[PDB]
Amino acid sequence: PTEIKFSHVVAENTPKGQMALKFKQLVEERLPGEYQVNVFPNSQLFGDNNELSALLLNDVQFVAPSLSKFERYTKKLQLFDLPFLFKDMDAVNRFQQSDAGQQLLNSMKRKGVVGLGYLHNGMKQFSASSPLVLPEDAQGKKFRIMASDVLAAQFQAVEAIPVKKPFSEVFTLLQTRAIDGQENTWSNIYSKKFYEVQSNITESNHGVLDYMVVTSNTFWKSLPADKRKVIKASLDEAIAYGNEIAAAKVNKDKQAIIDSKRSEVTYLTPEQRAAWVNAMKPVWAQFEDKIGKDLIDAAVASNE
């Protein structure tokens, strides 16, 4: 069988981990002996910094980076990093499924990247080794971020110190106290055991962590049209499965973290949330011209 590689950076028992395995299952059921999908979780094949290059060089055929990790290829996907842009995952999905959202799947074609679909994880929560209740609480604290200029600006807006590091490095940076805090979904916090070395988590819902599943023009064009259709169908179904898992993990992994008693979860009052919102609004102005105001207006409208 022709080998198709799918690489990613998360644990297996996560939305993206399960999406990738379901994709393998379906392709191999439908094209037995013709295509084999080998899945490489946990940055075993490629990590954050080199996966898109690998994709375009055809050393891997599918990857699904966070929407945050595409600045080299487009300035538009930075949209998804804007703090407090989407109220919740229902708004995210409405935006992604709309014409404005769907067009972004093609935003990188001129550099070789083909967008195949969105895949959910969830809303991001702040964590640290100390409480994060008001923006002032973040002052002077070092936070790991995904490699995103918008996320750097988010933390600079509250006088914190952002450091861009690949996902594979976060556990050790927290364990050694080389960083104070981070931001992520309950699924990543739980599956990577970040909560074991973060005494405090705030249910801030301050941004979205979702993915775009992508391939290269080279690989996608190389497939016969009939096989491409079967592979695309399998991917789409695997995405639906992954999204179901993402929605379940939000509740289940939050609960598991609380049950562990390792981390105190703080819930914000309306006045506290408003303070964070107000603090993180220089950020939108800084990036609106590059992202596109009309595109931001579309995303804002998904909250209605």
User: DSSP labels for 204-265?
Assistant: EEEEEEEEEEEEEHHHHHHS-HHHHHHHHHHHHHHHHHHHHHHHHHHHHHHHHHHHHTSSEE
Feature table: binding site: 16, 69, 144, 184, 188, 211
Q: Which DSSP helix (H) or strand (E) runs through 164?
A: strand 161-164
Residue 63, helix vs strand vs coil: strand
Cα–Cα distance for residue pair 292/220, rounded to 1 Å: 29
How does 82-119 read in b/e, with b if 16+ C-beta sit within 10 Å? bbbbbeebebbbbbbeeebbeebbebbeeebbbbbbbb
Q: Sign of dihedral through CA atoms 166, 171, 172, 173?
A: positive
* Both structure tokens of 210: 């979702």
- Decide: 52 and 9 in contact? Cβ < 8 Å: no
Which neighbouring-strand residues pair with 127?
Answer: 182, 201
- Return the axis-axis angle of helices 293-301 and 282-291, rounded to nearest 10°: 120
Nearest partner of 183 among 172, 194, 193, 175, judged by Cα: 194
Determination technique for this entry: X-ray
Q: What is the DSSP letter of 141?
A: -
Feature table: binding site for (S)-malate: 16, 69, 144, 184, 188, 211
Q: Give residues with Cβ within 8 angstroms of 200, minimum separation 6.
A: 127, 128, 129, 130, 131, 132, 263, 264, 266
Nearest partner of 242 among 44, 6, 28, 13, judged by Cα: 13
Do β-strands 113-128 and 200-216 pair in parallel, antiparallel, or remain unpaired?
antiparallel
Residue 33, helix vs strand vs coil: coil
* Both structure tokens of 99: 């014409």
- Decide: 61 and 219 in contact? Cβ < 8 Å: yes
Order of strands across the sheet with 200-216?
161-164, 142-145, 181-184, 113-128, 200-216, 264-267
Residue 145, helix vs strand vs coil: strand
- Decide: 77 and 296 in contact? Cβ < 8 Å: no
Apex CA 112: angle with CA 109 and CA 116, to 5°?
Answer: 60
User: DSSP labels for 1-28?
Assistant: -EEEEEE-SS-SSSHHHHHHHHHHHHHH
Nearest partner of 162 among 180, 147, 146, 142, judged by Cα: 142
Cα–Cα distance for residue pair 19/37, rounded to 1 Å: 12
What does CATH list as the number for 1-304? 3.40.190.170
Q: Which DSSP helix (H) or strand (E) runs through 285?
A: helix 282-291
Feature table: binding site for succinate: 16, 69, 144, 184, 188, 211
Do β-strands 161-164 and 142-145 pair in parallel, antiparallel, or remain unpaired?
parallel
Looking up tokens 């009309």 gives 294
Residue 95, helix vs strand vs coil: helix
Q: Using CA atoms in the order 126, 129, 133, 134, what is the torsion angle rounded to 10 degrees? A: -90
